[PDB]
Amino acid sequence: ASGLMCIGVTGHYDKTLGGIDKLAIYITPNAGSAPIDLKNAKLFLIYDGESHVLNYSTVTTATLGADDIFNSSAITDWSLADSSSYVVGVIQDADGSLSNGVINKGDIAVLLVNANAVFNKAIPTRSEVSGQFQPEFGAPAVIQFTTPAAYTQTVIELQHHHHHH
């Protein structure tokens, strides 16, 4: 029984857009999982009366060891997070497997999503977001959060889990 767990979601608040414009969904394998290929994995997100399906665009190691994973100067592959695609950032990967789109024991990946582009607007306060990240094989990671009623800083913890990023 292999599968993926969501270990957190953070959002970027852009005050000029009035909301959360970008999401970072942190993923790790279930304890004891076999390796899982991410390359055909689909991200399903429901928001505001629409369901969206996003596909794998590419992977980048530019996120590795970085405090700011929302910055498109430092992580230029944000340019590929569009209305129908996510980018995978490497967070932790001892053996390098994520650079071939394979997540294995101990790995942490982040799914970079341009919510402004997917939803055609930034996500306002008190908004419900629901979703699953489903690779071809194994069980899915689950996304559920309600954005807070006030956005007070640029990086917002949306879904809290324990596992380190």
The residue assigned the tokens 């996003």 is 54
The least CB distance from residue 146 to Ca ion, in Å, is 26
Cα–Cα distance for residue pair 64/28, rounded to 1 Å = 15
24 — alpha (psi -120 to 50), left (phi > 0) or beta? beta
Under rule CB under 8 A, residue 57 binds a second copy: no
How many residues are given for the chain?
165
Under rule CB under 8 A, residue 42 binds a second copy: yes
* 92 Cβ contact list (under 8 Å, min separation 6): 64, 106, 107, 108
* 149 Cβ contact list (under 8 Å, min separation 6): 125, 126
Give the number of other Cβ atoms within 10 Å of residue 160's Cβ. Answer: 10
Judged by beta carbon distances under 5 to 8 A according to partner kind, the member of Ca ion, a second copy, none in contact with residue 143 is: a second copy
Out of 2, 17, 18, 44, point to the residue binding a second copy (CB under 8 A): 44
Under rule CB under 5 A, residue 97 binds Ca ion: yes
* 67 Cβ contact list (under 8 Å, min separation 6): none
Contact segment (CB under 5 A) with Ca ion among 51-59, 71-79, 103-111, 115-123 equals 103-111
Cα–Cα distance for residue pair 21/101, rounded to 1 Å = 25
Contact segment (CB under 5 A) with Ca ion among 3-11, 69-77, 102-110, 149-157 equals 102-110
The least CB distance from residue 99 to a second copy, in Å, is 25
Nearer to a second copy, 117 or 139 (CB): 139
Under rule CB under 8 A, residue 131 binds a second copy: yes
Judged by beta carbon distances under 5 to 8 A according to partner kind, the member of a second copy, Ca ion, none in contact with residue 62 is: none
* Contact set with a second copy (CB under 8 A): 1, 42, 44, 46, 48-49, 51, 53, 126, 128, 130-132, 134, 136, 139-140, 142-144, 146
